[PDB]
Amino acid sequence: TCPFYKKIPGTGFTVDAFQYGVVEGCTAYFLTHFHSDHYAGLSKHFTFPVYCSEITGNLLKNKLHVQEQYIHPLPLDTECIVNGVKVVLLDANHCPGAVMILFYLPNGTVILHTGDFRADPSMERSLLADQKVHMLYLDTTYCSPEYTFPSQQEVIRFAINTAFEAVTLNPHALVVCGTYSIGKEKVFLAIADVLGSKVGMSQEKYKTLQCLNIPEINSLITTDMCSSLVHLLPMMQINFKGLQSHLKKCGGKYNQILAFRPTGWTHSNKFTRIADVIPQTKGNISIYGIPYSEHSSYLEMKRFVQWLKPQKIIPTVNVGTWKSRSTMEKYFREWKLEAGY
């Protein structure tokens, strides 16, 4: 059954609540983004209204075959009335099509649901600048000060420079990038752009990228693997055995693989600056773990919440243990006492 932190009180609305059957009293189901833990349960057999971004709607239609009559895309940064309640969708700076949702309740209460987000100072000049938020439903994925990582820009600079050096030294090297979901497309797009190549991938992954409204996409991606020296593979194949196997299939075009595994945070972020990152190597294969995050760092999250000054915070991640819950509650109180709200 549907948990309390996925319900929006005083409305008929739920958020990211498709795996619980028919939810009692739910007249409209919101979907913040197309990641599997959030869409779990949606299919061609779903017959209630779904509200989401245009990009999320494209993915629902083409990947999950949800019927067009039930998909309700909304524009960003625009006041919309849904079942008698004013709502706004805001860019979440997560994966393509990901949104935060502002709900203006009939009783005067204002709720922000962040979905999954990477907090940024640019959000301080969205439609949030105006007004008071009474309740914040917060992506607390990395809510502890040990969680540090670089900017996305710094990580992409490292990846571009690393790939360009390797292929200029050896014109017969292949670059491989791992993926298991939408998000983090800049990693493979930036590498292909510096190398003058299209990105080669499966038919299934090509279909997914065609749903994302990325400008000039037809110029950047392909299903013709032989025409490309940047290949995308499933994340599970980014290991010495899987990469050895892939190199065999390329028909003696290549004699080296440089591979990237975009992760989130790992314990090596504790002690290794992005510039000092080194790969795991076996023979003619090297693998780089790069900390490309689409979730807020601790510091980014703290700045956002101290700016917004919500009256109450409801975490939506790390909710399952008493230790996690107590830790998060202690940080929220510190933030409030430091800033004075």
Residue from the set 6, 35, 198, 231 that interacts with Ni ion by CB under 5 A: 35
| DSSP H/E element including 28 | strand 28-30
Using CA atoms, how far apart are residues 45 and 67, in angstroms rounded to an integer? 8
Task: Report 309-338 residues binding Ni ion (CB under 5 A).
Answer: none
Q: Which stretch binds Ni ion (CB under 5 A): 4-12, 81-89, 111-119, 277-285?
A: 111-119
From CA 166, how far away is CA 161, in angstroms rounded? 9
Helix, strand, coil share (%) of the chain residues, nearest 5:
35, 20, 45
35 binds, among ligand AWS, Ni ion, none (CB under 5 to 8 A by kind): Ni ion
Using CB under 6 A, which of 170, 202, 263, 272 touches ligand AWS?
A: 170
Shortest separation between residue 115's beta carbon and Ni ion, angstroms:
8
**116 lines the binding site for Ni ion (CB under 5 A):** yes
The mark string for 84-123 relative to ligand AWS (x by CB under 6 A, - otherwise) is: ----------------------------------------
Using CB under 6 A, pick the residue from 27, 109, 272, 284 that binds ligand AWS: 284
Q: What does 16 bind: ligand AWS, Ni ion, none (CB cut-off 5 to 8 Å by kind)?
A: none
Query: Which of 174, 221 has the CB closer to ligand AWS?
Result: 174
Find the length of the chain: 341
Residue 116 C-beta: closest distance to Ni ion, Å: 4
List the single partner that 116 binds among Ni ion, ligand AWS, none, CB under 5 to 8 Å by kind: Ni ion
User: Which residue matches tokens 């299209």?
Assistant: 198
249-268 residues in contact with ligand AWS (CB under 6 A) are 255-256
Beta strands in the chain (DSSP E): 7-8, 13-15, 28-30, 50-52, 71-73, 80-82, 85-91, 99-104, 110-113, 135-138, 173-179, 199-200, 221-222, 230-234, 256-263, 280-282, 285-291, 312-315
Least distance from ligand AWS to the Cβ atom of residue 178, Å: 19
Q: Which does 284 bind (CB under 5 to 8 A by kind): Ni ion, ligand AWS, none?
A: ligand AWS
Question: What is the rounded CA–CA span in Å between residue 5 and residue 108?
Answer: 20
State the minimum distance, in angstroms, from the CB of residue 254 to ligand AWS.
9
Q: State the first-to-last Cα distance of the chain, in angstroms, to the nearest integer.
A: 35
Binding segment for Ni ion among 66-74, 114-122, 195-203, 208-216 (CB under 5 A)?
114-122
Find, among 10, 167, 188, the residue nearest to 84 by Cα.
Answer: 10
Q: Which does 244 bind (CB under 5 to 8 A by kind): ligand AWS, Ni ion, none?
A: none
- Residue nearer to Ni ion on the CB measure, 99 or 287: 99
Nearest residue by C-beta to ligand AWS? 284
Pairing relationship of beta strands 13-15 and 7-8 according to DSSP bridges: antiparallel
256 binds, among Ni ion, ligand AWS, none (CB under 5 to 8 A by kind): ligand AWS
User: What is the total count of residues that contact ligand AWS (CB under 6 A)?
Assistant: 5
Contact predicate 264/235, CB 8 Å: no
DSSP code per residue over 87-144 = EEEEE-SSSTT-EEEEEE-TTS-EEEE--S----GGGGGSTTSS---SEEEE--TT-S
How are strands ordered across the β-sheet holding 256-263?
A: 221-222, 199-200, 230-234, 173-179, 256-263, 285-291, 280-282
Choose from Ni ion, ligand AWS, none: what does 205 bind? Cβ within 5-8 Å by kind.
none
**Residue 169 binds ligand AWS (CB under 6 A):** yes
Closest approach, Cβ 247 to ligand AWS, in A, equals: 11
> What is the C-alpha to C-alpha distance for residues 156 and 124, in angstroms, rounded to an integer?
25
Which residues lie near ligand AWS (CB under 6 A)?
A: 169-170, 255-256, 284
Which residues lie near Ni ion (CB under 5 A)?
A: 35, 116
